[PDB]
Curated annotation (Swiss-Prot):
GO terms for molecular function: folic acid binding; folic acid receptor activity; signaling receptor activity. Glycans are attached at residues 40, 132, 172. Changing residue 78 to A: Moderately reduced affinity for folate. The lineage of its organism: Eukaryota, Metazoa, Chordata, Craniata, Vertebrata. A lipid is attached at residue 205 (GPI-anchor amidated serine). The keyword Aminoacyl-tRNA synthetase does not apply. It comes from Homo sapiens (Human). It is found in: Cell membrane; Apical cell membrane; Basolateral cell membrane; Secreted. The gene is FOLR1. Disulfide bonds join 8-36, 28-76, 37-80, 60-146, 67-117, 106-180, 110-160, 123-140. It is a lipid-anchor; GPI-anchor; GPI-like-anchor. Primarily expressed in tissues of epithelial origin. Expression is increased in malignant tissues. Expressed in kidney, lung and cerebellum. Detected in placenta and thymus epithelium. Folate binds at residues 74, 78, 95-99, 128-133, 167. This is Folate receptor alpha.
Length: 207
């Protein structure tokens, strides 16, 4: 890994190399110029128990739309962003050889995600391991564990860092600081993560 810019991690759905995709579905639209995901992936990203991982958002009842939109974006960012190389790492697991860790998610992005999920429910603080997939999709391990979202995710930082086993590491930097990754951004103003990756790919460059 000498070049961590404009590259795609090696996961279950990513393409081998970045490339235009003017057919990406709604939320994944900001990545039409250059994406790591396919038209199909972006489409499935907006569906419940998608073809991607059969993940069920409604494990503790229907998750509020205002909250699911944040999980859909995360899917877009994770499955389409070509600016995550500075955080790519090899884990070697049944479904993905590589993945991202400690991505510096902007302070706001994490606080907004957290906020919009207050009215939602969940039974775990780690959505990567622990589910009961017997039914074909994940269901609560301990069915009686359902509680308000903030019960398992007390603070924004706990939600963004823990939920996806540390794929994120909420930064103190805010949107626009050029030092943090944004999962929400207006493509008409440009992709702000290009500059961020470049910055970090340099801080770890050389030695
Ligand atoms: N930012 C971000 N980072 C991620 O790592 C990420 N991962 C997913 C994929 N989520 C998941 C989580 C768990 C399982 C799952 O099947 N868990 C099983 C087996 C896990 C394994 O074998 O490694 C389980 O333990 O219950 C599948 C997809 C979606 N969005 C992400 N978004
Ligand atoms: C994405 O591709 C899979 C695999 O062929 C297919 O089952 C699924 O229906 C496709 N998504 C859409 C929305 O067509
Ligand atoms: C998983 O769910 C099934 C029901 O489909 C149940 O019989 C089994 O005891 C559960 N096991 C776990 C991991 O809690
Ligand atoms: C938090 O961000 C500040 C600048 O906003 C930086 O000085 C610091 O290294 C970061 N980490 C912590 C834990 O303060």
């Amino acid at each position: 890994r000498t070049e961590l810019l404009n590259v795609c991690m090696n996961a279950k759905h990513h393409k081998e190399k970045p490339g235009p995709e003017d057919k990406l579905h709604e939320q994944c639209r900001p990545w039409r110029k250059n994406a790591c995901c396919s038209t199909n992936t972006s489409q499935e990203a907006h569906k419940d128990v998608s073809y991607l991982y059969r993940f069920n958002w409604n494990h503790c009842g229907e998750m509020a739309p205002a909250c699911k939109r944040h999980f859909i974006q995360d899917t877009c960012l994770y499955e389409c962003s070509p600016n995550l190389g500075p955080w790519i790492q090899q884990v070697d697991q049944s479904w993905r050889k590589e993945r991202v860790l400690n991505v510096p998610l902007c302070k706001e992005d994490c606080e907004q995600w957290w906020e919009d999920c207050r009215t939602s429910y969940t039974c775990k603080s780690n959505w990567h391991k622990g589910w009961n997939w017997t039914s074909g999709f994940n269901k609560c391990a301990v069915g009686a564990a359902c509680q308000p979202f903030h019960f398992y995710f007390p603070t924004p930082t706990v939600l963004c860092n823990e939920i996806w086993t540390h794929s994120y590491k909420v930064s103190n930097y805010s949107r626009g600081s050029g030092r943090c990754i944004q999962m929400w951004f207006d493509p008409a103003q440009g992709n702000p993560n290009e500059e961020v990756a470049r910055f970090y790919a340099a801080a770890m460059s050389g030695t």
